Amino acid sequence: RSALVTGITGQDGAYLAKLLLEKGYRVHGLVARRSSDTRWRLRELGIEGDIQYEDGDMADACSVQRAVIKAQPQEVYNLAAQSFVGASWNQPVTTGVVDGLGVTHLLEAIRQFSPETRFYQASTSEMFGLIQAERQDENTPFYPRSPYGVAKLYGHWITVNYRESFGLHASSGILFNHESPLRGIEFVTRKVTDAVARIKLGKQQELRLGNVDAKRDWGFAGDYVEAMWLMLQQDKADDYVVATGVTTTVRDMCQIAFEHVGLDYRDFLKIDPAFFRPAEVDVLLGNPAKAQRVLGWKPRTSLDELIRMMVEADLRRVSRE
Ligand SMILES: NC(=O)C1=CN([C@@H]2O[C@H](COP(=O)(O)OP(=O)(O)OC[C@@H]3O[C@@H](n4cnc5c(N)ncnc54)[C@H](OP(=O)(O)O)[C@@H]3O)[C@@H](O)[C@H]2O)C=CC1
Ligand SMILES: Nc1nc2c(ncn2[C@@H]2O[C@H](COP(=O)(O)OP(=O)(O)O)[C@@H](O)[C@H]2O)c(=O)[nH]1
């Protein structure tokens, strides 16, 4: 029972790897070459030594092919990506190559070497961007609002196309924002909790955010990776929206974070235009009805609980510096 997880050093890769290991999977994690060790998330989950690392890059089709061949995975989870919207306008090509073509690279590796391996594409609610429905489900028309959303949209559709064109068991998980103590510092939730922690510990004096009016459906990565796995356990591949069904403004989330340490965010929050987006996704609100009905998946961790554990995690990290 082998699984190839790209983006294994990322937030989801860590939680998914952990989940896969508990299920007896030999977990192969595709790791891009970095100048320094980037496996802290895997160590945080205590599974860094339980993964068979595959040296490769999503932009290098050959290395992706090689990793698939070496892993002989029954399941492939494509979590590798330039996953930050905030960087997609600066590097729209790498975003498209990695998040879009990278999917094709994996699908091709699968199609040409082991068409039976099940594939999971890490699609995103960002694809709904300018939401065409108050609550977005699998049938809500997509409307990407960033090179990231567009690249992912490509990733989503190419996955669907390979499923439909070759009968590949390829599924696109349209996951809405999910955070955790492993959430990248680039994302608003981790940025906030990290700031709250440093502010609380007197190592920081302010928190600079952009659009605090943006509404996000935030879930726990730990819960979401379960949906990914469940998706690949289905006999027939399909796409599913995975979300909490609850959307919150960055402001309130920010308030939740500071309040958790007895602070008033208003005392440190500073709106900085440098963090505004060229084309904003004002609100995301997912409808995971299909996932609950078919996968039996449902979110367990609420935003409050999520922010709490993140703040706690960052308080521990900051206090250890
Ligand atoms: N988290 C969310 O809220 C949402 C995320 N997603 C998507 O699901 C996936 C997992 O998200 P999450 O864990 O937060 O993402 P992260 O950004 O935390 O981690 C995934 C990344 O993939 C690796 N990666 C990036 N570029 C390449 C490359 N060219 N070749 C190989 N590996 C690469 C990164 O390594 P390195 O760090 O060294 O670059 C890192 O592991 C991503 O595809 C993301 O876009 C979908 C919906 C929502
Ligand atoms: N990353 C980030 N987002 C911010 C910031 N200030 C406000 N936001 C907004 O909060 C939302 C969530 O951003 P992010 O966590 O990056 O996830 P996204 O949903 O993938 O864009 C968006 O609408 C951002 O524009 C900030 O400093 N950083």
Side-chain angles (χ1 to χ4, degrees), residues 1-17 19-25 27-202 204-235 237-269 271-297 299-307 309-311 313-315 317-319 321:
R1 219 180 179 195
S2 171
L4 171 56
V5 179
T6 68
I8 195 146
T9 63
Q11 163 182 263
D12 294 10
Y15 285 109
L16 180 61
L19 178 166
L20 295 173
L21 289 171
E22 309 178 323
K23 294 185 181 302
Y25 285 71
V27 179
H28 290 261
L30 185 72
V31 294
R33 187 281 166 167
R34 300 299 182 236
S35 63
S36 291
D37 186 276
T38 58
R39 304 172 182 180
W40 72 275
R41 297 190 172 83
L42 298 173
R43 297 198 179 78
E44 178 126 346
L45 264 35
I47 62 175
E48 191 279 338
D50 305 309
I51 295 167
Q52 306 197 199
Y53 297 102
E54 299 309 328
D55 184 357
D57 197 289
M58 294 304 298
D60 183 329
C62 306
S63 76
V64 171
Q65 177 70 85
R66 170 164 21 265
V68 168
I69 291 173
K70 182 178 176 301
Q72 301 189 65
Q74 272 61 67
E75 303 174 11
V76 170
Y77 293 90
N78 187 213
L79 308 181
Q82 179 307 79
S83 72
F84 187 44
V85 170
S88 64
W89 286 278
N90 284 148
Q91 46 183 115
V93 175
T94 284
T95 300
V97 171
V98 177
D99 303 6
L101 299 187
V103 185
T104 306
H105 291 170
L106 261 182
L107 290 171
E108 275 299 306
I110 291 307
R111 202 233 296 200
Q112 302 192 63
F113 170 70
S114 54
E116 289 308 301
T117 100
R118 301 187 179 185
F119 179 77
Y120 173 83
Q121 164 56 194
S123 287
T124 170
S125 49
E126 285 302 307
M127 303 186 315
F128 293 120
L130 186 65
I131 60 86
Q132 299 300 293
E134 179 177 3
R135 290 174 176 286
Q136 308 82 63
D137 55 42
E138 299 69 21
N139 300 306
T140 300
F142 299 122
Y143 198 121
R145 292 278 290 176
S146 71
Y148 167 71
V150 183
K152 280 296 189 177
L153 185 48
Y154 171 94
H156 164 77
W157 281 111
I158 202 238
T159 293
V160 171
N161 190 51
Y162 272 64
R163 173 173 70 228
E164 297 181 354
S165 295
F166 311 106
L168 293 190
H169 193 299
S171 308
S172 174
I174 306 175
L175 276 56
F176 279 63
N177 300 63
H178 44 284
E179 334 293 292
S180 67
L182 307 186
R183 180 55 144 159
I185 187 170
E186 283 164 330
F187 306 89
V188 77
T189 63
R190 179 66 192 293
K191 179 178 183 175
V192 164
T193 62
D194 168 74
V196 169
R198 315 183 94 74
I199 287 173
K200 181 62 179 184
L201 300 179
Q204 194 164 311
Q205 308 295 177
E206 65 170 7
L207 164 60
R208 287 181 170 295
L209 288 186
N211 174 28
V212 301
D213 302 309
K215 293 181 184 174
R216 287 294 180 285
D217 174 325
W218 283 297
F220 172 46
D223 292 353
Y224 288 41
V225 293
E226 307 186 322
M228 302 180 178
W229 179 77
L230 282 166
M231 283 180 226
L232 268 53
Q233 305 320 299
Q234 291 292 144
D235 287 334
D238 200 2
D239 316 314
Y240 305 78
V241 159
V242 177
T244 63
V246 177
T247 189
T248 314
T249 65
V250 169
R251 183 186 292 95
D252 292 348
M253 173 277 287
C254 191
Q255 187 178 309
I256 294 300
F258 280 86
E259 270 182 44
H260 181 63
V261 294
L263 297 179
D264 181 353
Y265 78 91
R266 294 172 298 182
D267 293 310
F268 316 85
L269 179 58
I271 302 74
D272 188 349
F275 295 110
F276 280 65
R277 305 283 172 73
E280 180 65 283
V281 171
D282 300 328
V283 52
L284 289 175
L285 179 53
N287 178 358
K290 186 183 183 185
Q292 169 172 167
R293 179 177 63 72
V294 179
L295 312 179
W297 182 89
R300 285 65 202 295
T301 305
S302 67
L303 173 60
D304 188 69
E305 217 298 68
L306 179 59
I307 297 171
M309 64 185 288
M310 285 178 71
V311 171
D314 284 314
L315 281 172
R317 293 159 177 160
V318 174
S319 67
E321 314 183 317

